[PDB]
Design a protein around this ligand. Structure first.
Ligand SMILES: CCCCCCCCCCCCCCCCCC(=O)O[C@@H](COC(=O)CCCCCCCCCCCCCCC)COP(=O)(O)OC[C@H](O)CO
Ligand SMILES: CCCCCCCCCCCCCCCCCC(=O)O[C@@H](COC(=O)CCCCCCCCCCCCCCC)COP(=O)(O)OCCN
Ligand SMILES: CCCCCCCCCCCCCCCCCC(=O)O[C@@H](COC(=O)CCCCCCCCCCCCCCC)COP(=O)(O)OCCN
Ligand SMILES: CCCCCCCCCCCCCCCCCC(=O)O[C@@H](COC(=O)CCCCCCCCCCCCCCC)COP(=O)(O)OCCN
Lengths: 29, 226, 226, 225, 224, 225, 31
C-alpha cells in the first residue's frame, strides 16, 4: 500500500568498535 | 557462564525485555507465515481450476452457465457478475464502447482490490524485519554500556568480571538477527506470490473482457448488417 | 558514572551536540505521529461513512441529493462537485465523449492532490528512520577516536580510566537507535494508512465517473432513438 | 590442523549455519547451470525466428513462413493468437474491436512468457541479499562463544579465544562465498531476461503491425472497388 | 587536537581527508544554490497557477497571462497550446489537435523536471562513495600502523594508538561528508517531485481550457 | 614487512589470486570507461546538432529534405525513415488514425532499442561496483585465517611475527575498495548520460510524430473540403 | 536514471569487524 521499510539495516559498527577498545588494553595489562 | 537458555533470565531488565520482545516478534512472524501460506495455496488452487474451466467459453452466456456453480466466494464469479451487472445496468444504451469502457474500468478496480485484500499482514512482516535488528542492537549496546558503567564504578581492571555482560549483549544481537531474517525472506516470498496471483486474476478478467467485446460486436454486426 | 541523566552532562562538545540533535529528531517524530494519527482517523472514518451512503446511488442526481448534506470539507462532496461543474461548463457541447474525458481528467488530478496532501510529512520520518543510525555511529566513532587520543597521550593502562569514555561513546548510538525505531514503525503505519485511504478515495471517484458516464449514455440514447 | 579441522570443532549452531550456506551455494550453482542452458537455447530459436520474420510483408505470408517452426515457437504462439482472434471475430464488421482484442491478448501472452522466464530469480535474489546476515549471525555466535570461553576460565590468552575466532572467520567466509556468486548470477540473468523480453516484444509488435495493416487495406479495398 | 592530526597522517589518509572535505564543501554549495532557486520558482509558479484558476477560456487565459514575464513556465505552456492551435489551422480533426497539444505539453513538463534535477547527480555519487573513501582511508591507516609495528618490532600496543586515531578520523570525516549528501538528495528529489506535480496541474488546466473551447465552438458552428 | 612488491609476494596463494582478480577487474572498468566515453560524446554531440537542425522543419517532406545528408548511421535519419516507410507501406489505406498508431508504435520500438544498445555495458560496472568490496574482503578473511592457523602452533613468544601476515589481508580489502570506487563513480556518470541522451532521442521522435500527424490531418481536411 | 544514491551498510559492517578480529588475536600477543 506504501513504500514501506523492509530493509534489515544493521549499522552496529559501534559495537565492534567498542569491543576493540576492550581488547586493546585487556591482554597487555 | 552456563548456556544460551541459562543466560537469558540472568540479564538486566532492559536486555531481558529486548529478548522477550524479539521472541514474541518471531512467534508472530511464524504464525503469520503459516496462516497466510495455507490461504494463498488454497486460493491459487481454486482460481486455477476455475480458469481452466472457463478457458473453453465462447460467449458471456456460456461462461456464466459454466460459472453458475463456482460457489459464493469465487473471484471468477465476482468478475463475471460485474461484467453482467454493467451490461444490465446500461440497458437502454447504444454506446457499446461506453459499456466496454465501464466494464473494463470496474473489473480492473475489482482486481486491484482483491490484490490489496490479499496483502494484509505484510505490514507486520516488513516492520518486524526492519526494526528487529535495531531492537537487538539497542539490547546489546545497553548491555555493554551497563557493563562498563559497572566496571568503572567497581574499579576492577580484569576481564573475567566483565565477559558475561558482553556475552549476554551479543546474545541479544544474535536473537535480533534470528527474528529479522525469516521475516524478510517471508515478506519477499509473499510479495512474489501476490504478484503472481494478481497476474492470474488479471488473465481471468482479460478473458471476461474479451468475451464481452466479442458478444457486443457480433450482436451489433448481426443486427445492423443483416 | 551513573546513567544517561548524568552521562550526557560531562560527555563532550561534539558528542553532546550529536545527542541533542538526536533528541530533537525524536521529539519531532512523536509530534508528527500524534498530529497525523488524529487527522487520519478522522478523515478515514468520515470518508468510509460517505462511501457507504453513496453505494446506493443509481444516477448523478440521486448522488447529489444524498450528498447535499456532507458538510463542506468532504472529499466526496468535492468530487461530486467536480462532476457537476464540468457538466455545467460544457453546457452547449454535444460531445459526450469530450465531457467524460474532461471529467475523468479533473478527478484524476483531484485524487492525486488529496493523496499528496495526506502524505505531506513523511519525508521527515523517512530520512530520520534512515539516517539516525549513521549519526549515532558518527557520535560513537568520535568518542572512540578521543578515547584513543587519551590512551596515546599521557600513556596509561587499566581500562578503569577509559571506561567513562567508552560509556559516553556508546550512549550516542543508543540514543540513535532509540530515535530511529519509532520513526520506522510510524512510517510503515502511515504508508499503509495512506495506501488504504487513496484506494478508498479512488473507489469513490470511480463511482462518480461510472454514474456520470452511464447517465450521459442513457440520456443520449433515450433522446436520439425515439 | 587446517581449515577442515577448524570446521570439525566448531559449535553446533555454527555448523548448522555453515551447512545451510553451503547448501544455498549448491542450489545457486544448479540454478545457474540449468537456467543458462535454457536461456541460450530459447534466445537462439527466437533470434532466428525474428530474423526470418523481418521480411514478412503480410500476415498470410508470415503464417506460411512460420507454418513449420515446431511447436514451442513463441513466435508461432503469437501468430496463431492473432489468427485465432481474426477467426473468432468472423461476422463482426468492427475492425477496431479486432485490433484491440488482438493487442490485448498479445500483451497478455508476452507478459506470461516473461513471468515464466523469470523463475528462480526470486530465490537467487533472496540468497544474494540475505546470506551476509546469516554470516553475521555466525560471526556473532563465534564472538559470543569466545567471550563465554574467556569467562569460564579467569585468563585471556590466545588459546581461550582461538575457538571463537575460528568460528567468526569461517562463518563469514562461507557467507561471502555463498553471497558473491548469487549476486553475479542474479545480475547476468536479470540482464538476459530484459533482453529476451525485448526481443519477444519486438516479434509481438511485428504481428500487430502486420495484422492492423492488413485489416485497414482489406477494408479500404472492400469499400472502394 | 583534531586539527593537529590532519598533518600527522602520512600520505594516503591526508589525500583522503582533503578529498572528503572538498566533497562536503561542494555539497553545501550545491544545496544553497539549488534551494534558493527552487524556492523562487515554486513561489512564482504558485502565484501564477492561483492567478490562472479564474480563467474560463483560452482567450481570457492569454489575457491574464499576457504579462507573466518570459521565464514563466505557465507562459511557456499556454504558448505551446496556442502554437499548436495556430499550426493546425485549416485542419478539422479537433481530436487530432487535442492529441498533439497534450503530447507537446507532457513532453514540456517532463523537460522542465529534468532541467531542474541538475546536480543531484553529484549529490547521489557523493552520498554513495563517501563512506567507502572514508573506510578505505581507515583500512589504509590501520594497515600502515601494523606495517610500522614490524619494522621496529615495537611489541607494545600502547604507542601505535595515534595510527588508529588517524584511521578512525578518516572514517568520521567520511560520514560527515556522506550523510548530508543523502539527506539533501532526498529533500531535492521530493521537492522536484512536488513542483513537477504542480506544473502538471497547470498543464492540465491549459488542456482542459483548450478542449472545452474546441468542443463548444465546433458544436455551436455545427448547430446554428 | 615490505612496501608493495614484497607485500604481494608475501600474499600467500588465495590472497594473491584475489588481488590479481581485483586488479584485472579495475583494469576492465577503466577500459569500459575510456572506450565508452568517446562513443557517448560523439553520438550526443551529433544528435544535438541534428535535432537543432530539424527544429526548423514544418512538414515531413521538408524534414526529409533537410535530413537527406546526415550519413547512414544517423538516428534522426532512422526515425524519419521509419515514418516514411510506414506512410509507404500503408499506400491504399484510408485510416489516418491507423497510420498514426502504427508509426507511433514503430517509433517507440526504435527509441527503446537505441536506449538499450547505449546502455549495453553498464551491467559489468554495476556488478563490479556491487561485489568488489566483498571479494577484497574474502581475500582479507582468508589471509587473517591463514595467519591465525599459521600461529596456531604453540608460539609462546612475543616477537610479533603476525604483523606482516596480518597486514596483507587488509591490503586485499584496500584493493577491493580501490576497485569498487571508480566503478560506482562511472556507473553514475553513465546512468545520467544515458538518461539525458534518451530524452533527447525522445524529443526527436516526438517531433517526427507531430510533423507526420499535422500533415496527415491537413491533407485529409484539404481533400475532403 | 538508475544511479546509486544511498549508502550501503553491508560492505561497511563486514570490514569493521574483521578489523576487530585482527585486534582480538594480535592484542593477546603482547601478553
Ligand atoms: C578465488 C576468487 C576468484 C577471484 C575473481 C574475482 C572476480 C572479481 C569480480 C568479477 C565479476 C565480473 C563478472 C560480471 C558479470 C556481469 C556481466 C554481464 O552482465 O554480462 C551479461 C550481459 O551484460 C552485457 O550485456 C555487457 C557485459 C559485457 C562485459 C563482460 C566482460 C567480462 C570480463 C570481466 C573481467 C573479470 C576478470 C576475471 C579474471 C579472474 C552477459 O550477457 P551476454 O549477452 O553477453 O551472454 C553471452 C553468453 O555468455 C555467450 O556464451
Ligand atoms: C553527521 C551530520 C549529519 C547531520 C544531518 C543533517 C542534514 C542536513 C540537511 C538539512 C536539509 C534541510 C532540508 C530542507 C527542508 C526544506 C524542504 C521542505 O520544506 O520539506 C522537506 C522535508 O523536510 C526534510 O526532509 C528535513 C530532513 C530531515 C533533517 C533531519 C534529519 C537529520 C537526522 C538528525 C540530525 C541531528 C544530528 C545533528 C548533530 C550532528 C522536503 O519535503 P518532503 O518531501 O520531505 O515532505 C513534504 C514536506 N512538506
Ligand atoms: C540455519 C540454517 C540457515 C539456512 C540458510 C538459508 C539461506 C536463506 C534461505 C533462502 C530460502 C529461499 C526461499 C525460497 C524463495 C522462493 C519463493 C518461491 O519459490 O515461491 C514458491 C514457494 O515459496 C515458498 O513456499 C518458500 C518459502 C520458504 C520461506 C523460508 C522461511 C525461512 C527462511 C529463513 C532462513 C534463514 C534463517 C537465518 C537466521 C537463522 C511458490 O511459487 P509457485 O511456483 O509454486 O506458485 C506461484 C508462483 N510463485
Ligand atoms: C526458528 C528460527 C529459525 C528458522 C529456520 C528456517 C529454515 C528454513 C529452511 C529453508 C527452507 C527452504 C524451502 C525449500 C523449498 C523452496 C522451493 C522453491 O525454491 O520454490 C518452489 C516452491 O514450491 C512450492 O510449492 C513451495 C511450497 C511451500 C513450501 C514450504 C516448505 C516448508 C517450510 C517451513 C519452514 C518452517 C521452519 C520453522 C518451523 C517452526 C517453487 O518453484 P518455482 O520454480 O515454481 O518458482 C520459483 C520462484 N518463486
Amino acid at each position: 500500500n506504501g513504500e514501506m521499510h523492509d530493509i534489515n539495516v544493521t549499522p552496529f559498527i559501534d559495537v565492534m568498535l567498542v569491543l576493540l577498545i576492550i581488547f586493546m588494553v585487556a591482554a597487555p595489562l | 557462564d552456563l548456556s544460551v537458555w541459562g543466560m537469558y533470565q540472568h540479564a538486566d531488565i532492559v536486555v531481558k525485555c529486548v529478548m522477550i520482545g524479539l521472541i514474541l516478534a518471531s512467534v508472530v512472524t511464524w504464525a503469520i507465515f503459516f496462516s497466510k501460506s495455507v490461504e494463498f495455496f488454497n486460493q491459487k488452487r481454486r482460481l486455477k481450476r476455475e480458469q481452466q474451466l472457463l478457458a473453453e467459453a465462447r460467449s458471456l452466456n456460456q461462461a456464466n452457465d459454466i460459472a453458475a456453480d463456482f460457489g459464493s466466494k469465487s473471484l471468477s464469479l465476482h468478475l463475471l457478475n460485474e461484467a453482467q451487472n454493467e451490461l444490465e445496468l446500461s440497458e437502454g444504451s447504444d454506446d457499446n464502447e461506453g459499456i466496454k469502457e465501464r466494464t473494463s474500468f470496474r473489473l480492473e478496480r475489482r482486481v486491484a482490490a482483491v490484490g490489496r485484500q490479499m496483502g494484509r499482514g505484510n505490514g507486520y512482516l516488513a516492520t518486524i524485519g526492519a526494526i528487529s535488528p535495531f531492537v537487538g542492537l539497542f539490547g546489546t549496546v545497553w548491555g555493554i554500556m551497563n557493563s562498563f558503567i559497572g566496571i568503572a564504578q567497581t574499579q576492577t581492571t580484569n576481564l573475567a568480571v566483565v565477559a558475561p555482560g558482553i556475552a549476554e549483549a551479543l546474545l541479544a544481537t544474535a536473537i535480533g538477527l534470528v527474528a529479522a531474517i525469516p521475516a524478510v525472506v517471508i515478506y519477499n516470498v509473499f510479495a512474489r506470490q501476490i504478484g503472481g496471483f494478481k497476474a492470474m486474476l488479471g488473465d481471468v478478467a482479460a478473458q471476461v473482457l474479451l468475451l464481452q467485446s466479442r458478444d457486443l460486436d457480433l450482436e451489433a454486426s448481426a443486427a445492423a448488417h443483416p
